[model samples]
Target: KDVIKVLTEDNSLILLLAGSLRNRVTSIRNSLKSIKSQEEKLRKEKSLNNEFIQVIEDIKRDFEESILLESEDVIRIIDDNLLMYSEEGARAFCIKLKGDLMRYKAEILKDEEKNQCIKQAVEFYEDALQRERSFLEKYPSDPLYLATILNYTILKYDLLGNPEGAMKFANRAIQAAENSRSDQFSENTEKLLKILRDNVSQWEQGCSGLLTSAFF
Candidate 1:
């Protein structure tokens, strides 16, 4: 059993939580890698064996187990965080996380469950992006807002199957990025901006595929 911290320190609660979610994902991925390697090892050592191949089917079943655990565990923690805090910034952050969780589950999904989770994810992201914009308004190029845009747009491109929609959102984010005309964007902000533009350039060329992922 992995023990996750309660994270009671409210002084930088949201900042701390940013790591908690990220931290769990790190663990989640490490576990996936272990499963992948074991599967690979299970093969190669033996000829195309039957009972051995049976191991592969059970492997997918067990893999689904991790997906379920991640979907439930991460979402539950976010809900707990929402119930605990009352800051727009924090709430908005949680909402974006909701989108991310749903987006993830969509891949491993039972798939209208994909529909269900993704539908929910979109709304969660819209709500978060809207709220986050105000937070950005209160300050300079905040990476959170850009990061939110990145996730929402890519979800459209990758899972939702809408490159046109993705490109539009990507373009808008850069414009939104410049709207404040800050003395300079944050380092993280610039990095995310580069990702956005680089991706947009590919789509502008109407290339094969846009690599899709998120940054928080």
Candidate 2:
């Protein structure tokens, strides 16, 4: 009976050791697989970002060399492929490209054509507005934030025909620019303020049909 008890205890101890070793091996394998998967994901993401940046640069080069209509086409092609929802820089680039395209069309095209361009541009600008707002949450009074506000103000007043909204951002931008204390920033703010003031006056006069058009 004593011999049998010793044999049983030895068997139990061996089995316990074997179970622990199996569990350790399995845990190590799973950890290795996880690391490999994560590494591949990051590798793919980096490759995608590089490709996107290169394409964007190419589009910019093309735009600089091409006529306005051709540039717009190139930009539209680039915009179609911008599928990187996880990238903030891509969104920012989209905003800039759209805004520039809109301005270009407005400069060269007339009434209906310019209006169409502005409509398209507003969509992109609004997309940027949401993203920029998120950035502002983090950066608050960042100079970049102030600059974006100035840009948005101009877009509202000049493009969107919302003098009231533009005035609000113009005020905020001026305050931020003054607080920043860089002459460059202040100069931009002053220019925008002048534009806003002129626009407001024009809007008032246009109500009485004394101006060709408030925007004109």
Candidate 3:
């Protein structure tokens, strides 16, 4: 009876050891699968990022070649793709593109002593605003885009003199950002809105010296 009891105990120990080994093997297999999956995702994301960067660079070069080239078709195509590919990256590109377009438009407006081009630039920004609104609907969590639109609206209206429209767009931008409440976005939105508010107030005081005096 003592020998039988000892044999039973030995069998139980061996079974416990086997179960542990099996669990470890299963765990290792799961870990490897997870690792491979993550690697593949990373590779795909990197590839997409590189493609976007390349496309943007090409557009920038084209724009630099001639600011007055009327490359709207090209710009629109690239922008549309960017918007579809990576909404966040594309929004950023648009923001920077906004500044460039404005600067060139402002220059042409001055050089020709005409407000037509500047007005055109305004229209361009209007389009940007519309697109941005649509994009925000897709990724309501993106705070940077909200902050940018808000700040630009202030510049367009307060700094450049279009209070009604500026107020409308800026307010929308702020509202969108406020809804997000992302920490990074919240801080940026708060600061940008404050700047916009102050600028709008300052502009309302007396035109801010012709920033909005043209073609009013």
Candidate 4:
């Protein structure tokens, strides 16, 4: 969720501000986090964290509603315009976005609908893997490449119900990130790595728990 803390939508503003999908997504996420921190500051600065809960709750509801609306609008951009990327990246970027959006929508659904979104998320990520050989490999420093692996790994481990597949994906990401070569220790790289690793371990324990219960 903290990883998601930084994504975005709202087609006109989102589209006009950026060129690459990475920029726009980063833009949207930054705005989302900005709004969140501002709201938190309002509460803490006022020293009234519990009172006037109505107004704070109102802000929270507004953003949640706004995010989903942005979700659809961003999806439209992909459907209508961003396919220009498909041929460039061998559709790796586009595939990953669909996977991202599919996983996003899955957060709020259940039963068959949730199942379908997650399943599609898996399909698109696998497609991304095929395409990455043609694209991501050539650009060793692109963190988004690792992101695809992390997302797919978490999805398999948590959402799609496949632990071994999750390990398979994460190991590949580790291999790539290790060999990808970077000295920047860039803020971008470290933050993403921090959360991805933290989140992954929580599930490793969950997997261990399953073993304790005899791999039910």
Number of clashing residue pairs in every model?
1, 0, 1, 4
Error of 1 at 40 (Å): 11
Of 3 and 4, the candidate ranking higher by lDDT: 4
* Residue pairs of candidate 1 with colliding backbone atoms: 111-114
Q: What's the lDDT for candidate 2?
A: 0.50
List where candidate 3 sits over 4 angstroms from the true fold.
Answer: 1-88, 111-116, 137-143, 151-155, 158-161, 168-172, 175-185, 207-216
- lDDT for predicted candidate 3 compared with the true structure: 0.48
CA lDDT, candidate 3, residue 92: 48
Off by over 4 Å in 2: 1-67, 81-86, 135-137, 161-164, 176-216
Tens-digit per-residue lDDT, 126-200, candidate 2 = 666567667544333443344345455556766677766666665655555456553233353445445544545
Error of 2 at 26 (Å): 60
Top of the candidates by TM-score: 1
Q: Is candidate 2 or candidate 3 better by lDDT?
A: 2
Can you list the residue pairs that collide in candidate 3? 160-211
lDDT of 3 at 97: 52
Q: Which candidate number has the best lDDT?
A: 1
Local lDDT at 166 for model 3 = 74
Model 4 worst lDDT window (10 residues): 207-216
Residues 144-165 of candidate 1 have per-residue lDDT tens digits of 8888888888888877889898
Ranking, lDDT, top scorer first: 1, 4, 2, 3
Tell me model 4's lDDT, rounded to 2 decimals: 0.60
How big is the positional error of residue 29 in model 3, measured in Å on the Cα after superposition? 58
Q: Whose TM-score is higher: candidate 1's or candidate 3's?
A: 1
